[PDB]
Amino acid sequence: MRLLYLHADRFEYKTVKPALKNPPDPPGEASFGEALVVFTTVEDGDGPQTVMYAASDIASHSSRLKVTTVILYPYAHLSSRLAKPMAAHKRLIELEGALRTKFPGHVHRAPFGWYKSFSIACKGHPLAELSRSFTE
Amino acid sequence: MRLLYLHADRFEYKTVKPALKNPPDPPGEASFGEALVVFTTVEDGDGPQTVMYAASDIASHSSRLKVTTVILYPYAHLSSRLAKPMAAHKRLIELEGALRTKFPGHVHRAPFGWYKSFSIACKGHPLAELSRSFTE
Ligand SMILES: Nc1ncnc2c1ncn2[C@@H]1O[C@H](CO)[C@@H](NC(=O)[C@@H](N)CO)[C@H]1O
Ligand SMILES: Nc1ncnc2c1ncn2[C@@H]1O[C@H](CO)[C@@H](NC(=O)[C@@H](N)CO)[C@H]1O
Ligand SMILES: [Mg+2]
Ligand SMILES: [Mg+2]
């Protein structure tokens, strides 16, 4: 699993066209104030152990930033070892569920299988942009 | 070299604190309208051949999107095989120079060695977010 953590002042997205024949989540749009935005690329080897490590890490980082909103944003572009779309969707559902057991704030999982527009205002402090890898 | 291509309606950044002992570029800030924003991670094996392939690709993609501004945005977070900071800075200067020989619009290389805030409004069409690898 490859993640990018962006500490945002604000974030919003809108699904536009479908990117899979039948996107497994409905279309939608949402906007947020301050948040940790986690761009999340699910990889071929990812399983339950991977999901739990990433959930732990996201919670730990969120705590250190003092953020109370996490956005789990599915993202196909951070890796060249992608899991197939249905497995990736399952692992993202699992990550959202695991994160809720470790982090007390708002957890928003953005819809999977859509092309999306987005806007982000990313903070510029030293911990505002980090990347992470998890495996098992 | 690992790149992320984001087709933006607007982009802006500001250097904040230095991220290297002596950043090789001055502090600064800039904002743009529609542009191709290229987050660029220089990797250990990158040399002149790599730079030329990436410059060709960026020009080709820009043409297909009908964009007339490219932002070359140094980014440490897209790879786990980073070139050292001074080599990365040299390859980014080279990429900017090579791109000008292939693409006729505005080429802006953002300062290297700074933590930066940024804001982007990324389009949501099917070619608005792509990633690329180059090697030699
Ligand atoms: N292995 C994987 N890891 C994470 N997300 C994955 C994935 N495989 C498919 N997706 C999702 O399907 C959309 C089309 O690739 C993806 N959409 C996107 O990546 C948008 N940000 C493009 O605008 C994403 O929702
Ligand atoms: N191998 C490499 N490829 C691309 N850029 C590289 C690099 N090694 C160092 N940098 C630059 O040094 C700043 C601190 O890592 C980096 N700064 C950043 O990546 C900001 N976006 C953080 O706010 C970047 O300017
Ligand atoms: Mg809509
Ligand atoms: Mg300033």
Rounded distance, CA B24 to CA A36, Å? 30
CA-to-CA dists, residue A64 to A4, A36, A123, B125, angstroms: 16, 11, 15, 35
Kindly state the DSSP code that residue B102 receives in the 8-state scheme.
T
Contacts 24+ apart (CB under 8 A), A13-16: A13/A73, A13/A110, A13/A116, A13/A117, A13/A118, A13/A119, A14/A116, A14/A117, A14/A118, A14/B124, A15/A111, A15/A114, A15/A115, A15/A116, A15/B124, A16/A114, A16/A115, A16/A116, A16/A117, A16/B124, A16/B125
Ligand 1 center to residue B81 CA distance, Å?
A: 24
DSSP string, A45-74: T--HHHHHHHHHHHHHHHHHHT--EEEEEE
Torsion of CA B80, A48, A34, B75, to 10 degrees: 10
List B13's β-bridge partners, or say none: B30, B118
Residues 6+ apart with CB under 8 A from A23: A15, A111, A112, A113, A114
Which of A52, A110, A116, A51 minimizes the C-alpha distance to A83? A51
What values do phi and psi take at B114, rounded to 5? -115, 150
Which of A7, A26, A19 minimizes the C-alpha distance to A109? A26
Say if residue A89 is exposed, middle or buried (CB neighbours under 10 Å; 0-12, 13-18, 19+).
Answer: buried
In this structure, are strands A29-32 and B35-41 parallel, antiparallel, or unpaired?
A: unpaired
Dihedral of CA B89/B94/B96/B97: which sign?
positive
**Distance between first and last Cα of chain B:** 10
Dihedral of CA A83/A87/A89/A93: which sign?
negative
Largest CA distance in chain B: 40
Yes or no, beta carbons of B78 and A124 under 8 Å apart: no
Q: Which residues of A60-76 are buried (b: 16+ CB within 10 A; e: fewer)?
A: ebbeebebebbbbbbbb
CA distance A124 to chain B (A): 4
CA-to-CA dists, residue A4 to A73, B67, B70, B98, angstroms: 10, 26, 23, 29
**3-state class (DSSP) for residue A4:** strand
**Residue B129's closest chain A neighbor by CA?**
A77
Rounded distance, CA A135 to CA B21, Å? 33
What values do phi and psi take at A57, rounded to 5? -65, -45
H or E, element range at B36: strand B35-41
Kindly state the DSSP code that residue B101 receives in the 8-state scheme.
T
**Residue B5's closest chain A neighbor by CA?**
A77
- Cβ of residue A37 lying under 6 Å from some atom of ligand 1: no
Method: X-ray
**Residue B14's closest chain A neighbor by CA?**
A124
Which of A12, A18, A17 minimizes the C-alpha distance to A30? A12
Contact A32, A72 (CB under 8 A): no
Q: Name which of B29, B75, B122 to mutate to probe chain A: the one with the most chain A Cβ atoms within 10 A of its Cβ.
A: B122
Domain that holds residue A5: 1-134
Yes or no, beta carbons of A118 and B122 under 8 Å apart: yes
Rounded distance, CA A131 to CA A110, Å? 19
From chain A, the residues in CB contact with B14 under 8 A are 124
Name the interface residues of B facing A (CB cutoff 8 Å). 4, 14-17, 19, 77-78, 80, 115-126, 128-131, 133
List B74's β-bridge partners, or say none: B40
| Helix, strand, coil shares, percent, chain A, to 5 | 25, 40, 35
In this structure, are strands A35-41 and A69-74 parallel, antiparallel, or unpaired?
A: parallel
Q: What is the CATH number of the domain that holds A124?
A: 3.50.80.10
Contact B106, B72 (CB under 8 A): no
Yes or no, beta carbons of B117 and A118 under 8 Å apart: no
Task: Show the DSSP H helices in chain B as ranges.
Answer: 48-65, 85-100
Contact A114, A16 (CB under 8 A): yes
From chain A, the residues in CB contact with B129 under 8 A are 77
**3-state class (DSSP) for residue B82:** strand
Structural domain total, chain A: 1
